[PDB]
Fold:
Amino acid sequence: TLNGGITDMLTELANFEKNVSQAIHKYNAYRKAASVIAKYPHKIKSGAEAKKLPGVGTKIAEKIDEFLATGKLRKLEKIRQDDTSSSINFLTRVSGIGPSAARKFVDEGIKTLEDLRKNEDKLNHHQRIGLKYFGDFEKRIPREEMLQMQDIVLNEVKKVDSEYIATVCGSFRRGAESSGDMDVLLTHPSFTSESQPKLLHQVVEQLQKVHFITDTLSKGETKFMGVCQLPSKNDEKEYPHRRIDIRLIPKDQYYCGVLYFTGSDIFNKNNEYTVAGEPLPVDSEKDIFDYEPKDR
DNA sequence: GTCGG
DNA sequence: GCTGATGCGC
DNA sequence: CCGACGGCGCATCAGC
Ligand SMILES: *P(=O)(O)OC[C@@H]1O[C@H](n2cc(F)c(N)nc2=O)CS1
Ligand SMILES: [Mn+2]
Ligand code: NA
Ligand code: NA
Ligand code: NA
Ligand code: NA
Structure:
């Protein structure tokens, strides 16, 4: 809301550091700064005022000054008009195209999605899938669809083996009314940290079998990443294709896993598996609290 | 780019 | 053919 | 001044 022009500017500069300059620590400096300014409850009137906040320093303060005087940054204006840099930044929006792959393409004169379409042969598997669903992957998912998606996953996991346990984590578990993707945690009593069968593959295969899963970006023994889609009517309009992650965790580390991927971000910082220690037994998420998703 | 040893 | 490094997403 | 700044699974590349 307040400082939005400032926060948009910073997030834009951040994206240029990451995607074009390949300077990841500066990308995080701009994001840290964008985040503290976003939570600052006043409208900022000067650089010096901003500078007081942790993560805002001399250079960001002078930039805030230029923006406040002119509504612009010479530097950002210039790079947006720049064909190379601007194209590199844009292509990274395609899932599977990082900063390195974006620069090689634009060096060969491949600058748009149309150019990408004409050169399928030059893309790897992840990248074709990302191109194909380019607009779908940017859409958010309504809760209502997430509940329908949840219904399909719990039903089908349970069909393969009733001893599986599955939990849809992320913001959704925290009760959020939209979500960026679907993250699912899976375990099975026979998979323990000190032990294993194709417990991921059988679940992925059942969901492909009923046409919930439509494509595969990556798939190993522990982690699957891919695309899914709700069924529609022949009459009604098609659902967008959605991202879905599935992680197989051992039973002991499960509730430690759930806790971690359920979050939120800020809440956790207050490990994933959990002066070297010795591994404590957990039958539930509350054993950890001992040693509620919604209010987070 | 910002922080802090 | 194998291992170790890098790119990528999150 | 000058180094830290996050870790991990999977796909794919570089190198032997
Ligand atoms: P995605 O569904 O965006 O995020 C869920 C989990 O959060 C963890 N996470 C996210 C992230 F963006 C970064 N950089 N690190 C990280 O550990 C793991 S996936
Ligand atoms: Mn997610
Ligand atoms: Na500051
Ligand atoms: Na990308
Ligand atoms: Na780049
Ligand atoms: Na995810």
In short: The longest strand of chain A covers residues 213-219. The CA atoms of residues 155 and 256 of chain A lie 24 Å apart. The pocket of sodium ion (ligand 6) is lined by residues A 181, 183, 245 (CB under 6 Å).
